[PDB]
Amino acid sequence: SPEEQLLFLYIIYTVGYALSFSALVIASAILLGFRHLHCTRNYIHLNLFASFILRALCVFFKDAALKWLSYQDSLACRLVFLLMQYCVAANYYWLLVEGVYLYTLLAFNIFEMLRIDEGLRLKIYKDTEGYYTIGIGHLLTKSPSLNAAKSELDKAIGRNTNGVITKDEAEKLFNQDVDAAVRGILRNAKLKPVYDSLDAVRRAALINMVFQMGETGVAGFTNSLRMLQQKRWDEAAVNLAKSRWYNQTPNRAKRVITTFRTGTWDAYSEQWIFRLYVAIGWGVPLLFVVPWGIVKYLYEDEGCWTRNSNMNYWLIIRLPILFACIVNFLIFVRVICIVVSKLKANLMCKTDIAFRLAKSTLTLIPLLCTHEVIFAFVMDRFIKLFTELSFTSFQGLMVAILYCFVNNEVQLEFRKSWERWRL
Ligand SMILES: CC1(C)CC([C@@H](Nc2ccc(-n3cnc(C(F)(F)F)c3)nc2)c2ccc(C(=O)NCCC(=O)O)cc2)C1
Ligand SMILES: CCCCCCCC/C=C/CCCCCCCC(=O)OC[C@H](O)CO
């Protein structure tokens, strides 16, 4: 039956957007409700969720206006259609920043953490404590003798120093120092169990402490190390604030303690970057959506602009999205090369956030951009292609699943809350 086919596809479409709307509101409520989920990653998720929620609101509004001049001739319809077009471009560009954030998350590590904290020195300098230092936090000897310090650096670099050391030599010594730090931790009886239980991010935090203080130094934090091994992060944060380390160097200590408490790099992020993300996800759609609306209002205005087959006006809305998908696939490829690298070199386990986040984002990219690339310049089997509506309806539900409901951290929050109710 012809009419029966159209009706049944209508049902699956509307229940797709119903399940998606409900799931996205529930998932955003989870991300906002639990305080431990308040990190930049989940904020980016919340903006993506909002774009999908608004898309669903447009769908329900268009459907609800069918009940009670026809609706195709009104201007309210053209406004709802323009808002929906905006939401679609927002989906694709917040997916773009999702991918960009993932890439930079894979590019940050202990080496960059320490290059921020310790600084770079070109010449020998006598630090406040009496130690001569150079490079990236490379302390030589407390011996108050510039002559002997330059010699001690000469044997530890290979060539004659004279005082000035190039950037390459400093990076070489920096790798040496970081490897010594990890070998120290694994050769310590009070630090190996906790380091082996920590995730890569909190591992880098522990290494940071060892790079500043020392192997036997941080082993003195008996009280904090025990509760770090017990997954009780917040207790250990407040405990680490009551330290000599926190009062001597507070700005570095707060960054490291944040990394322990949350397991993220948020304490090393620049805050204008997130504003550039919001200027991409919400701002750039505004930059090609509204001229399309202007030209469709002045030069192609017939039935809420549904007859979009005349001129270049279809391209000014489809070339930007193609752009956002092209880059999204290039990111898609590059990320893969990185992840399989870091997994093979045992720099990363499949239990870390970078891998799980790639496990979701690498799914969504070819799930949302492959249609746009395949039919790139095609303007316009009927039942079989009407199955695009089912997937575009269930898109937001899948976003809520892959970015909330199967996330391990939120499942932790639910079990922790039930445990609080029992005890
Ligand atoms: C629709 C499906 C049938 C596909 C989906 C599935 N996709 C998926 C699974 C594995 C790899 N993968 C492995 N190795 C590589 C390599 F090569 F390294 F890149 C990629 N890639 C893609 C999926 C499963 C599990 C999750 C998941 O737990 N999310 C929560 C993690 C989080 O948000 O914190 C997400 C997606 C399920
Ligand atoms: C709205 C219209 C519906 C269309 C929706 C169809 C989506 C099906 C995906 C096709 C992938 C094609 C290109 C993907 C590239 C292959 C790479 C790959 O398989 O990924 C490896 C990694 O391990 C895990 O993704």
Author numbering: 136 to 203, 218 to 257, 1001 to 1160, 261 to 372, 380 to 422
Give the original sentences from the paper that presented this experimental model.
One class B GPCR, the glucagon-like peptide-1 receptor (GLP-1R), has been considered as an anti-diabetes drug target and there are several peptidic drugs available for the treatment of this overwhelming disease. The widely accepted two-domain binding model suggests the ECDs of class B receptors recognize the C-terminal helices of their hormone peptide ligands, thus facilitating binding of the N-terminal region of the peptides to the TMDs for downstream signaling. Wild-type TMD of GLP-1R (residue range 128–431) is extremely unstable as suggested by size-exclusion chromatography (SEC) and thermal-shift assay. We have previously described that ten thermal-stabilizing mutations were introduced in the TMD structure of GLP-1R in complex with two negative allosteric modulators (NAMs), PF-06372222 and NNC0640, and we showed that a di­sulfide bond (I3175.47bC—G3616.50bC) and a GCGR mimicking mutation C3476.36bF are indispensable for crystallization.
To study the effects of these sites we made further constructs in which we mutated back single point (C2333.36bM, named M9 hereafter), double points (C1932.63bS/C2333.36bM, named M8 hereafter) and quadruple points (C1932.63bS/C2333.36bM/A2714.47bS/F1962.66bI, named M6 hereafter). The three new constructs were crystallized in complex with PF-06372222 in the same condition as the M10 crystals. As a control, we also measured the thermal-shift data of apo proteins whose melting temperatures decreased by 5–8°C, suggesting that the PF-06372222 indeed stabilized the receptor in each mutant. Fig. 2(b) shows that compared with M10, the M9 and M8 constructs have similar and slightly lower melting temperatures, respectively, which is consistent with our finding that residues Cys1932.63b and Cys2333.36b are not di­sulfide linked. The similar melting temperatures of M9 and M10 suggest that the endogenous M233 residue and the modified cysteine residue (CSD233) contributed similarly to thermal stability, while the ∼2°C decrease of M8 and M6 indicates that the back mutations of C1932.63bS, A2714.47bS and F1962.66bI slightly affected the protein stability in solution. While the previous M10 crystals were collected to a completeness of 95%, we could only collect data of the three new constructs to a relatively low level of completeness (M9, 88.8%; M8, 77.9% and M6, 79.9%) because of limited resources. The densities of key side chains indicated successful mutagenesis of specified residues [Fig. 2(c)].
